[PDB]
Design a protein around this ligand. Structure first.
Ligand code: CL
Ligand code: CL
Ligand code: CL
Length: 263
């Protein structure tokens, strides 16, 4: 049996819903260690330890741009930290270092008897997410820390599009009409550079650069996919293989690519 499987068998409609099966609570990190600020989202009733995910915004941006993922993922059985960077103008390398410091602090709080997440985290199972420069930072985190179990980035941007060393399962949401980090010159080159991993590319029809951010009109599809990808790869949960690897019939999806995503 899979010791990391949590929750009932999913369906497309239940993964499209706004909340998964677990109750979510949250707290503000009191003394952030190596990053600006953090909010920790966690399930109260997951039925065992769960993996941890750290999410980073883009240039100038704060937690609110990316924090819908917090309850979306936590309610399916994850501990999620959404961070503010030390400076809103930090670049992708710094964002990556901060993202890894936030994972480090989730692991420390897992061992802190006073923390709400004491004993809730499997600190051997971690993932990285982020928007734009925070997505570039996440890809650098994955390249530099190949024990990470999954990455899921949105409208990623970085100074280099060559992420060929990444062996971490990587999902990319791209936004069709993005003029900040365009699909043709940024998101698809990043995707195409990776030959050593499970990977996926989903282009959202008509989406602006913020098409995967909090308040987007496609939280059903985007949230299904992000949760399925993290469940499949962070939990090794093959009940999620169908949803993680599926080529969606969604009017929100304008392009789909995947490789090494076994059904
Ligand atoms: Cl950015
Ligand atoms: Cl780096
Ligand atoms: Cl845009």
């Amino acid at each position: 049996s899979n010791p990391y499987a949590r929750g009932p068998n999913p369906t497309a409609a239940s993964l499209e819903a706004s909340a998964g099966p677990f109750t979510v609570r949250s707290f503000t990190v009191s003394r952030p260690s190596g990053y600006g600020a953090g909010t920790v989202y966690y399930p109260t009733n997951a039925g065992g330890t769960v993996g941890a995910i750290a999410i980073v915004p883009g240039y100038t941006a704060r937690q609110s741009s990316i924090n819908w993922w917090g309850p979306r993922l936590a309610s399916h059985g994850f501990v999620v930290i959404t961070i503010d960077t030390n400076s809103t103008l930090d670049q992708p390398s710094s964002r990556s270092s901060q993202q890894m410091a936030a994972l480090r602090q989730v692991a420390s709080l897992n061992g802190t008897s006073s923390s709400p997440i004491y004993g809730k985290v499997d600190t051997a199972r971690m993932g990285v997410m982020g928007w734009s420069m925070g997505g570039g930072g996440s890809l650098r985190s994955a390249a530099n820390n190949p024990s990470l179990k999954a990455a899921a980035v949105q409208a990623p941007w970085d100074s280099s599009t060559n992420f060929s060393s990444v062996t971490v399962p990587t999902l990319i949401f791209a936004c069709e009409n993005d003029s900040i980090a365009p699909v043709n010159s940024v998101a698809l080159p990043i995707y195409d550079s990776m030959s050593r991993n499970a990977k996926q590319f989903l282009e959202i029809c008509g989406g602006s650069h913020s098409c995967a951010n909090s308040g987007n009109s496609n939280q059903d599809l985007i949230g299904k996919k992000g949760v399925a990808w993290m469940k499949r790869f962070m939990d090794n949960d093959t009940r999620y293989s169908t949803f993680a690897c599926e080529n969606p019939n969604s009017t929100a999806v304008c392009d789909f690519r995947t490789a090494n995503c076994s059904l």
